Amino acid sequence: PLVHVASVEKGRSYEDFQKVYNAIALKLREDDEYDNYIGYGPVLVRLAWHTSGTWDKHDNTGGSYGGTYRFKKEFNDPSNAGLQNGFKFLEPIHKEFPWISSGDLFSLGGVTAVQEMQGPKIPWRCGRVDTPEDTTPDNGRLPDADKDADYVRTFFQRLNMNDREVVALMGAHALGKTHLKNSGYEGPWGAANNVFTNEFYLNLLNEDWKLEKNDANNEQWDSKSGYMMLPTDYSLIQDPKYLSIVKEYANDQDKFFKDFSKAFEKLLENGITFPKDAPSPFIFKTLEEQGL
Ligand code: HEC
């Protein structure tokens, strides 16, 4: 197993990363029209997860550390279709702050998006270091959506996530939507899809779902409110262990926030060794908290 030791960008401290956070946050506010006024929040959360979610605990390949999505093999992974929009949004940020590593920027984009969308605070640590093109993981390590709960459970063991962490992370599917041209699935999961809430679990339990085929000839679950669930989303209410946890998060907003925060930080930190004297995780203030 490879070791990736966090190395703080030289001379940087919390203030420097709060400025990067702020630039991302201000651009999220400015470029509000994207994706029919959903805004870039959801795609940036997805970019942070896909750049992290290639990790393999068994050999420490993939993961957020190396920033490898900047290389064409990963950029062009069919599982990443659509994420180029988030990369494009981050380009002017990286140009302004060229000292931040790519993995630090992709992960911080996700943290900033969750918090600016009124999600929980996500502690975040710096020090990912860009690694060379030959460290890019091959395609095929991100999950399929047409699968059942057994597939989801097994898939996430590779990311060292347990049932609770899986169910909490999937609550990010409140955000954004599926786009047929990107993934073969179409529609949002709920109404509040650029504000981070526990709506995903409420809709799983509360909506009347019908198994339909979309225009790409794939099955998805649809509600008459115009929401959808992927087969892997719906698996969370088919499996009795996941269903218990879905009910818990549908009934406790604060517990979902706390558990999501922990699991998302862990996702973004998998694979990284933080030296004992590394800085503590940073908790960035939102623009609203700063009066900006
Ligand atoms: C914590 C983050 C998170 C996790 C974990 C996650 N997703 Fe997503 N996913 C998102 C976000 C956010 C979006 C919305 C992106 C957008 O609106 O551009 C999304 C969108 C998608 C889409 C639609 C992409 C498109 O633009 O068409 C698919 C398909 C998808 N997820 C599949 C899955 C599957 C399969 C899993 C696991 C079994 C999963 N996701 C786990 C955050 C996540």
Numbering used by the authors: 3 to 294
Paper passage:
Oxygen activation in all heme enzymes requires the formation of high oxidation states of iron, usually referred to as ferryl heme. Ferryl heme refers broadly to a highly oxidized form of the heme in which the iron is in an oxidation state that is either one equivalent (FeIV, known as Compound II) or two equivalents (formally FeV, known as Compound I) above the resting oxidation state (FeIII). Here, we report 1.06 Å and 1.50 Å crystal structures for Compound II intermediates in cytochrome c peroxidase (CcP) and ascorbate peroxidase (APX), collected using the X‐ray free electron laser at SACLA. The results indicate that the ferryl species is finely tuned across Compound I and Compound II species in closely related peroxidase enzymes.
We thus developed an anaerobic procedure for direct formation of Compound II in CcP (see Experimental). Single crystal spectrophotometry at 100 K on crystals of CcP that had been reduced with dithionite under anaerobic conditions, followed by anaerobic reaction with H2O2 (see Experimental), showed absorption peaks for Compound II (λ max=530, 560 nm) that reproduce those in solution above. The Fe−O bond length extracted from this XFEL structure of CcP Compound II is 1.76 Å (with an error estimate from SHELX of 0.013 Å). Nonetheless, in this structure the Nϵ atom of His52 shows no density for a hydrogen atom and the imidazole is therefore more likely to be neutral (not protonated). The density for the guanidinium group of Arg48 is flat with all the hydrogens in‐plane, which is as expected when Arg48 is positively charged (Arg48 is also observed as charged in the neutron structure of Compound I). There are several key points to note when comparing with Compound I. First, the hydrogen bond patterns to the ferryl are the same in CcP Compound I and II (i.e. hydrogen bonds to the Nϵ atoms on Arg48 and the Nϵ proton of Trp 51) and do not allow space for a OH species bonded to the ferryl. These hydrogen bonds to Arg48 and Trp51 appear to be “locked in”, as the same hydrogen bonding pattern is observed in the X‐ray structure of CcP Compound I and in the neutron structure, Figure 5 B. Since the neutron structure of Compound I in CcP conclusively identifies a FeIV=O species (from the absence of nuclear density for a OH species), then we therefore interpret this ferryl species in Compound II of CcP as also being unprotonated (i.e. a FeIV=O species). That said, the bond length of 1.76 Å in this CcP Compound II structure is measurably and (within error) longer than that for CcP Compound I (1.63 Å). By comparison no such flexibility in hydrogen bonding to the distal Arg is observed in CcP, as the active site hydrogen bond structure is “locked” in a fixed arrangement that does not change between Compounds I and II.
